[PDB]
């Protein structure tokens, strides 16, 4: 019926300037623009949903092309509502500036 | 970063004889046991000396 996930942009990796740590990603969740607002999103499940050539099995359905890398929002990055997330596979740099879905599925409210 | 000098951290004494002779190497097994198990410091000195080179254990005259 409706959207049950919040719009996050994979802005880039946790990096220095001349070193990047690919294991941690830096999400930009739409609406939250301060460390105050990002208290809600800590521990939330987040998916990089993409689609590839070959039909992979879909749990609760027949094989679609759409795939996921399941992540978790770990903590607040920086001062301005950015958030660190850590994925079961280090995200591809294909997805820098593309949509990942921070879900409300690990609710605390 | 710890300011240690590793120059002398390895102690350069014998743990065992350099020899492959079995009769000595059985006497070492016997005094490996007696040294560490008995409270006697004698057995520690005998074990220590079974390791040592031909030149370090020179012949004692009658």
């Amino acid at each position: 019926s409706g959207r049950l996930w919040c719009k996050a942009i994979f802005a880039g990796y946790k990096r220095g300037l001349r070193n990047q740590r690919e294991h941690t990603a830096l999400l930009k969740i739409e609406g939250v623009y301060a460390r105050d607002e990002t208290e809600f999103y800590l521990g939330k499940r987040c998916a990089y949903v993409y689609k590839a050539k070959n039909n992979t099995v879909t749990p609760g359905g027949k094989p679609n092309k759409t795939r996921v890398i399941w992540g978790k929002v770990t903590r607040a990055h920086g001062n301005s509502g950015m958030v660190r997330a850590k994925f079961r596979s280090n995200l591809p740099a294909k997805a820098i500036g593309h949509r990942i879905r921070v879900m409300l599925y690990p609710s605390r409210i | 970063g710890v300011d240690i000098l590793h120059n002398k951290d390895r102690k350069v004494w014998r743990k065992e004889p350099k020899s492959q002779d079995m009769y000595l190497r059985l006497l070492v097994k016997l005094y490996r046991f007696l040294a560490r198990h008995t409270n006697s410091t004698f057995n520690q000195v005998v074990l220590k000396r079974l390791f040592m080179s031909r030149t370090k254990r020179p012949p004692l005259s009658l």
């Binding site: - | 970063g1 710890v2 300011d3 240690i4």
Partner: protein, 225 residues
């Protein structure tokens, strides 16, 4: 016929149990007496200060007996005289901490390394969390964690330091056996200060972190511990 062995081996088992309880009660009552002492020490420094103010005089409190010296600068490019003193203070690594008793011989060893250390006059609570959280005993030349009192009773018991509280009392209230109880402690492996340093290079007085922070080491111990 074993009935005597069975009974005798159970009496020995029991004699050590009642002996534990008696030591366990001593350790309990020693700590209860120490709570009474720290009250009286803290309360008298107020009492003395007050009657001096009532008179219109001043109460200059005792120059402190006990410092907690943390190393704040690293291992690279250090003068030989500074190297030597820092390893006599057992500060061989950045953010290592040791308790140092103040006298004339010690304070001239803490001005010779002033740029490289941050020290002060630690609180009672600073001595607690350091000895409990970070407290590792040097037992048979091995850094072994103070997880039971009998680690402290086996090394230091000949100086009548038979529990964690006896060690804390001997450090804070710099006792006759401060040297042995302090050398028993391994230098405290403290983490980097959470919220940051102000400025490593310069002295605390000129907006830095190096040198003497009298009351103010306790702000940074709680930050680093």
């Amino acid at each position: 016929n074993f009935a005597e062995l069975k009974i005798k081996r159970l009496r020995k088992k029991f004699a050590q149990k009642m002996l534990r309880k008696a030591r366990r009660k001593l350790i309990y009552e020693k700590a209860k007496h120490y709570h009474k002492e720290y009250r009286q020490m803290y309360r008298t420094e107020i009492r003395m200060a007050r009657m001096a103010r009532k008179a219109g005089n001043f109460y200059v409190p005792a120059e402190p007996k006990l410092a907690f010296v943390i190393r704040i600068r690293g291992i690279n490019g250090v003068s030989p005289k500074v190297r030597k003193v820092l390893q006599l203070l057992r500060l061989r690594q950045i953010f290592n901490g040791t308790f140092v008793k103040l006298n004339k011989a010690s304070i001239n060893m803490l001005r010779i390394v002033e740029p490289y250390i941050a020290w002060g006059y630690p609180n009672l609570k600073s001595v607690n969390e350091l000895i409990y959280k970070r407290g590792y005993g040097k037992i048979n030349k091995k850094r072994i964690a103070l997880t039971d009192n009998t680690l402290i009773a086996r090394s230091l018991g000949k100086y009548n330091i038979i529990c964690m509280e006896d060690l804390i009392h001997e450090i804070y209230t710099v006792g006759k056996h401060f040297k042995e109880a302090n050398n028993f402690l391994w230098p405290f492996k403290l983490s980097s200060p959470r919220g940051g340093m102000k400025k490593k290079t310069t002295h605390f007085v000129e907006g830095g972190d190096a040198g003497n922070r009298e009351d103010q080491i306790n702000r940074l111990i709680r930050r680093m511990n």
